[PDB]
Design a binder for these strands. Structure first.
Ligand code: NA
Length: 90
RNA sequence: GGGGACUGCGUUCGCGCUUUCCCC
């Protein structure tokens, strides 16, 4: 497909001094056939935040690695919201 | 029996699994 602009809203998390979580909006250029996992790769390259630590949400949907951006009907200027994933357990 | 930190993960976002531990 044709590459589109996808935005990622990064958290503002200054206590995470190992990453660059400064509230910025990342702007990536990717085709709509690219999988959501590619967004995590590019977020890792820009913030240092590993993919396994990223929680992505698009229009309230917890988008999954194996689906393409087109699967979620993303378009130019779509904003993906990034959060820190927190693990649980008993 | 509670809370944390991790290593990876899953998730319906409620948490759950796991890995090293650390405490109360
Ligand atoms: Na719900």
């Amino acid at each position: 497909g044709s590459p589109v602009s996808i935005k990622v809203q990064v958290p503002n998390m200054q206590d995470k001094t190992e990453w660059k979580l400064n509230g910025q909006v990342l702007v990536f250029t990717l085709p709509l056939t690219d999988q959501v996992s590619v967004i995590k790769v590019k977020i890792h390259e820009a913030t240092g935040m590993p993919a396994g630590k990223q929680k992505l949400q698009y229009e309230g949907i917890f988008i999954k690695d194996s689906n393409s951006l087109a699967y979620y009907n993303m378009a130019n200027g779509a904003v993906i919201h990034l959060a820190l994933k927190e693990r649980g357990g008993r």
